[PDB]
Enzyme design. Structure first.
Site, mmCIF file in Angstrom:
data_model
loop_
_atom_site.group_PDB
_atom_site.id
_atom_site.type_symbol
_atom_site.label_atom_id
_atom_site.label_comp_id
_atom_site.label_asym_id
_atom_site.label_seq_id
_atom_site.Cartn_x
_atom_site.Cartn_y
_atom_site.Cartn_z
ATOM 1 C CB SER A 1 -1.659 14.557 -13.301
ATOM 2 O OG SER A 1 -2.103 14.257 -14.535
ATOM 3 C CG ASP B 1 -2.074 1.027 1.290
ATOM 4 O OD1 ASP B 1 -2.042 1.724 0.444
ATOM 5 O OD2 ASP B 1 -2.454 1.139 2.294
HETATM 6 C C1 LIG Z 1 -10.934 -3.556 3.608
HETATM 7 N N1 LIG Z 1 -9.618 -3.899 2.815
HETATM 8 C C2 LIG Z 1 -9.193 -5.011 2.479
HETATM 9 C C3 LIG Z 1 -8.722 -5.186 1.128
HETATM 10 C C4 LIG Z 1 -7.460 -4.335 1.072
HETATM 11 C C5 LIG Z 1 -7.472 -2.971 1.858
HETATM 12 C C6 LIG Z 1 -6.503 -2.068 1.437
HETATM 13 C C7 LIG Z 1 -6.895 -0.890 2.121
HETATM 14 C C8 LIG Z 1 -5.708 0.067 2.070
HETATM 15 N N2 LIG Z 1 -6.307 1.361 1.080
HETATM 16 C C9 LIG Z 1 -7.975 -0.555 2.896
HETATM 17 C C10 LIG Z 1 -8.943 -1.467 2.950
HETATM 18 C C11 LIG Z 1 -8.934 -2.707 2.617
#
Ligand SMILES: CN1CCCc2cc(CN)ccc21
EC number: 3.4.23.22
Length: 330
Positions: free
Chosen positions: A199, A35
């Protein structure tokens, strides 16, 4: 040093990508969601509330001879969608694609929101934004990349996400065989802790390029491309029958449509997102209404170049003293 790991879509829509990560001694391999929009490395663990684990692989620190409780440290992160996870902290050895960091903070979840429990394929997140966003208290911790940086051949990582296919995260080197043409670098602001850049504009399909500054973040952990309402309206106006649905939560379009491409500017260069990358399929099983991959950021507060945009490019996250981002076509 360098590392190189394959990242694999979790489902047929590329909703997210998982990358295997070795934690502890002997290694416990967990599939984490790299992430670039957050800065915590957290995992499902033997400490996670049992009712909140549903198929994930867990980290068990008591089985790792190199794990050490980081005494007094806790963490708690709320994500932009309202999802959350929290817990305590161990340090342990963490390896990605052959690149090893000792003493990495591994944040062990005691609690996770239902949205995480429901995603059985994701065992945790590995944050790659700036360490100023790390949530560990009372002593903020460094990301895996920050800990590895000094050992790397070059202080960079690259994201090469696949469309309906695996891709690659590399650490410490640029694979000059992984892209076409040249890489165009652009300035980054770290003031909000993100890989935030501007951008230079956009085009819809074969239409003329509109030169306009669009500040946003390069975020591998977000699925879609979130842009200003003006831009998004201009895109969907080129799709017959597309409309914004308050009940569904964004733009939807007839599944029978062929979508136009979307181009975004990086300096004088252009990255083209093919139309097919913008199709996120039926809103519910069997529906002929499909969910769009370009959505308005108006309710977020920031524009987000998520996976829809990033997977159209080879992306360099340059963590030199003055960070920059690079984009190439591929
Ligand atoms: C709820 N979920 C599980 C799947 C992967 C993931 C990643 C983030 C980071 N933006 C937020 C939620 C989430």
């Amino acid at each position: 040093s360098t590392g190189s790991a394959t990242t694999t879509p979790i489902d047929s829509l590329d909703d997210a990508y998982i990358t295997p990560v070795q934690i502890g001694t002997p290694a416990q391999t967990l599939n984490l969601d790299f992430d670039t929009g957050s800065s915590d490395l957290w995992v499902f663990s033997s400490e996670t509330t049992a009712s909140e684990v549903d198929g994930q692989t867990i980290y068990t620190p008591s089985k790792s001879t190199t794990a050490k409780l980081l005494s007094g440290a806790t963490w708690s992160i709320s994500y932009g969608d309202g999802s959350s996870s929290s817990g305590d902290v161990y340090t342990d050895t963490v390896s990605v694609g052959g690149l090893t960091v000792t003493g990495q903070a591994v944040e062990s979840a005691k609690k996770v929101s239902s949205s995480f429990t429901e995603d059985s394929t994701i065992d945790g997140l590995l944050g790659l934004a700036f360490s100023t966003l790390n949530t560990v208290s009372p002593t903020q911790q460094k990301t895996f990349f920050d800990n590895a940086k000094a050992s790397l051949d070059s202080p960079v990582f690259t994201a090469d996400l696949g469309y309906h296919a695996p891709g690659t995260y590399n650490f410490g080197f640029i694979d000059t065989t992984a892209y076409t043409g040249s890489i165009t670098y652009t300035a980054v602001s770290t003031k909000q802790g993100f890989w935030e850049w501007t951008s230079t504009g956009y085009a819809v399909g074969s239409g003329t390029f509109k030169s306009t500054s669009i500040d946003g973040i390069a975020d591998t952990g977000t699925t879609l491309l979130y842009l200003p309402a003006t831009v998004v309206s201009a895109y969907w106006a080129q799709v017959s029958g597309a409309k914004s649905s308050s009940s569904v939560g964004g733009y939807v379009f007839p599944c029978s449509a062929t979508l136009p491409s979307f181009t975004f500017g990086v300096g004088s260069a252009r990255i083209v997102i093919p139309g097919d990358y913008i199709d996120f399929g039926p809103i519910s099983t069997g529906s002929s209404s499909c969910f769009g991959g370009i959505q308005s950021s108006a309710g977020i507060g920031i524009n987000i170049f998520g996976d829809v945009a990033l997977k159209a490019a080879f992306v360099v996250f340059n963590g030199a003293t003055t960070p920059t981002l690079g984009f190439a076509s591929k």
